[PDB]
Ligand binder design. Structure first.
Ligand SMILES: Cc1cccc(F)c1-c1cc2c(cnn2-c2ccc(N3CCN(C)CC3)cc2)cc1C#N
Length: 280
């Protein structure tokens, strides 16, 4: 983590949403994304060092490249590879729902990133449309993977108060005790999201959604229209949304599934999508 004004090395161009910036390298000419974070009272950047070193050693085509961080004037600027189409959520809010094939390509590319992340003993944890970014070439990039500020404040005010927590609580509070196969589940939900513009139960209260998942006789969600999709896509959803982690398949096992291993899946499918965005 570097320790100077990133304006020295980069030129700001425009705000995007939520304060992420379009920017260009003054020397290299490469476009970048700068994710900025305010840091007021008693934030410590040195507690994000194990999570930055996870993000730095991630070197894969389907992961957003990390380029370095900048602490300056009580602000943390995280620099990254720019994806000019935004997230799949940004796109589908204009385009409407994705075709099965477009979803199939997305799922394979996401699976490829997850396979890589899992082989390194890393877990993504927040797989959804908003974190699947798309470049102008129609390639698929997973975004950064929480432990800071008002977010880390709120999250623990739930589990307990940190100074009074036991080690077993602490362990759960930081990491969740759960495994890589959680991302496989999250992908299955994302495939429904892309298909239907919302995940299952988006009109239901989040806590009740969580509660029901723990109850006996729980049924994992499904695609709403049966006839719109192939049996292969219905199977992809069945299998990713396996209730038990013990029986849910791995990312590499999922790359053998008909839906993602079928021929003719490539970035052209998303080039159609980005054309549709421009002409909606
Ligand atoms: C996902 C995310 C959540 C929260 C904070 C964040 F910084 C990011 C985030 C956003 C990112 C990138 C890399 N590129 N972009 C990016 C670029 C342009 C656009 N726009 C939207 C409006 N359109 C009209 C044009 C296209 C959207 C997103 C990396 C992260 C990370 N990590």
């Amino acid at each position: 983590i570097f320790n100077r004004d990133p304006r020295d090395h980069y030129d700001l161009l425009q705000r995007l949403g939520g304060e992420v910036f379009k920017a260009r390298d003054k020397v290299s000419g490469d476009l970048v994304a700068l994710k900025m974070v305010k840091m007021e009272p008693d934030d410590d950047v040195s507690t994000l060092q194990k999570e930055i070193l996870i993000l730095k050693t991630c070197r894969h085509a389907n992961i957003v490249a990390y380029h370095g961080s900048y602490l300056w004037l009580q602000k943390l600027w995280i620099c990254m590879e720019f994806c000019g189409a935004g997230s799949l959520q940004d796109i589908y809010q204009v385009t409407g729902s994705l075709s099965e094939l477009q979803i199939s390509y997305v799922c394979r590319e996401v699976l490829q990133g997850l396979a890589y992340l899992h082989s390194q003993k890393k877990i993504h944890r927040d797989i959804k449309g908003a974190n699947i970014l798309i470049n102008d070439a129609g390639e698929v990039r997973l975004a950064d993977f929480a432990q800071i500020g008002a977010t880390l404040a709120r999250r623990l005010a739930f589990i307990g108060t940190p100074y009074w927590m036991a080690p077993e609580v602490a362990a759960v509070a930081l990491k969740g005790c759960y495994n890589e196969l959680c991302d496989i589940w999250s992908l299955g939900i994302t495939a429904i999201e892309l298909a239907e513009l919302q995940p299952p139960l988006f009109d239901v209260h989040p806590l009740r959604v969580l509660f029901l998942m723990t109850k006996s006789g729980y049924q994992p969600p499904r695609l709403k229209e049966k006839g719109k999709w192939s049996a292969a896509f219905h199977n992809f959803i069945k299998v990713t949304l396996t209730k038990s982690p013990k029986k849910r398949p791995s990312a590499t096992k999922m790359l053998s599934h008909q839906l993602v291993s079928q021929p003719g899946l490539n970035r052209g499918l998303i080039l159609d999508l980005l054309d549709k965005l421009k002409n909606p």
